[PDB]
């Protein structure tokens, strides 16, 4: 009967403010503390703050001049409210009920995907990966997705019905832009025959590119 | 603020086995109160950290018996006594009783296997992406164990070491192996001025890394 529902931007410029407002349910405000922790992209969670059930507040040390969490005991929200973001700032932020006392409502937010960028939104170049002249029975295709943003794109490969052997990379920041490759890896006895196309779709830009993978 | 010093950072097992993570505080972690209010979460990829344990040694709603909180002062440890599948991901350990509050560094609970050398590729940059003035060339190092592996680029028997991006996968569901993707992002000038491009895999599987070249000229 429990949870904590998250509403914040997904995008936040240089030098502009973060506001996040969780709800929560099944539990008061009036009597438990809650927190809020982030995750940067491929690192561990960092406890950020608590607003107690009587108000007062403590912060990470390092978050005490730009961070303020206050809430509204009638309406069950807390709000998180950080100035001064930069690039290094892009993180998941979570508000949860932790340091559990005499309750069992350890519950978290979904949490909430911060990026801060002001980069524009880019679709990206999609460029075959095809064997170079160098024959055993399997042979490893891709499609390198360059120079986009934000994030995601979606890959799949013969729209979704070839999934084994896939490999889809996690996306890395180039500049201000993303990119990624996957890799799929299929039957010589059948390529290239059996054709093979990636397809690559960015939301943002609503972008949806096929490129088949043939010999050179 | 009170250091929480987990170890390992990478802890391999296979299904069945017991898995024992620990974490040290820098001081003691009990409360004016009597409480010591030490707590121990699983992360799976894409979810929220959830609790497992709390206080130390209680259980929270729902999570099996099969794990196991104890220790006290500076010392805790997290036991988990027959791993199962829906165990596999990054434990951390949190410390609620002296502000701020703080995280360990994480435990990555995963398969072991046996191990496995990686199938490497190279590729040239595309013809279609040269047009536009780019060069990248891609390395791929496919269904490798362990995870630990090092490449090395080298171009004309040179090290580079700017303009590579490195991204690795999670441990496979299927086969527990891992892959990574290895880009090397020239200019086209810069790509078109030299000739051999090497990918150079040093794995655990061999004293000897696995080295996939190509030179432009034979393209
Ligand atoms: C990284 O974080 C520091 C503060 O810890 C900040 O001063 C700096 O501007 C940030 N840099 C980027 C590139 O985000
Ligand atoms: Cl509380
Ligand atoms: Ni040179
Ligand atoms: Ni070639």
């Known amino acids: 009967e429990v949870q904590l529902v998250e509403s914040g931007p997904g995008l936040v410029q240089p030098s502009q403010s973060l506001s996040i407002t969780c709800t929560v349910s099944g539990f008061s405000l009036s009597t438990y503390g809650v927190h809020w922790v982030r995750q940067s992209p491929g690192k561990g969670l960092e406890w950020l703050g608590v607003?107690?059930?009587?108000?007062?507040?403590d912060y990470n040390a390092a978050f005490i001049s730009r961070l303020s969490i206050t809430k509204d005991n009638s309406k069950s929200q807390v709000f998180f409210k950080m100035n001064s973001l930069q690039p290094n700032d892009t993180a998941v932020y979570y508000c949860d009920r932790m340091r559990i006392t005499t309750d069992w409502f350890a519950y978290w937010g979904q949490g909430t995907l911060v990026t801060v960028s002001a980069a524009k939104t880019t679709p990206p170049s999609v460029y075959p990966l095809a064997p170079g002249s160098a024959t055993n029975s399997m042979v490893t295709l891709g499609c390198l997705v360059k120079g986009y943003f934000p994030e995601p794109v979606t890959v799949t490969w013969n729209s979704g019905s070839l999934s084994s052997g896939v490999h889809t990379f996690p996306a890395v920041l180039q500049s201000d832009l993303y990119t990624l490759s996957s890799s799929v890896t299929v039957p010589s006895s059948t390529w290239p025959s059996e054709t093979v196309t990636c397809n690559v779709a960015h939301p943002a830009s609503s972008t949806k590119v096929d490129k088949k993978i043939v010999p050179r | 603020d009170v250091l929480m010093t987990q170890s390992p950072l990478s802890l391999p097992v296979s299904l069945g086995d017991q898995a024992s993570i620990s974490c040290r505080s820098s001081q003691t972690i009990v409360h004016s109160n009597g409480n010591t209010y030490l707590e121990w979460y699983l992360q799976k990829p894409g979810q929220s950290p959830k609790l497992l344990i709390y206080?130390?040694?209680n259980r929270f709603y729902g999570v099996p018996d099969r794990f196991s909180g104890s220790g006290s002062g500076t010392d805790f440890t997290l036991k988990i006594s027959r791993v199962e599948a829906e165990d596999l991901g990054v434990y951390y350990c949190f410390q609620g009783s002296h502000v701020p509050y703080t995280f360990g560094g994480g435990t990555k609970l995963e398969i072991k296997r046996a191990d496995a050398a990686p199938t490497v590729s190279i590729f040239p940059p595309s013809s279609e992406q040269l047009t536009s003035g780019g060069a990248s060339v891609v390395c791929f190092l496919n269904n490798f164990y362990p995870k630990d592996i090092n490449v090395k680029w080298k171009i004309d028997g040179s090290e580079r070491q700017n303009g590579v991006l490195n991204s690795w996968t999670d441990q496979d569901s299927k086969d527990s192996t891992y892959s990574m993707s290895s880009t090397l992002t020239l200019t086209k000038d810069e790509y078109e001025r030299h000739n051999s491009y090497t990918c150079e895999a040093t794995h655990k599987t061999s004293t000897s890394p696995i080295v996939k070249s190509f030179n432009r000229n034979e393209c």
């Open positions: 607003i107690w059930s009587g108000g007062s507040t």
């Open positions: 206080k130390v040694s």
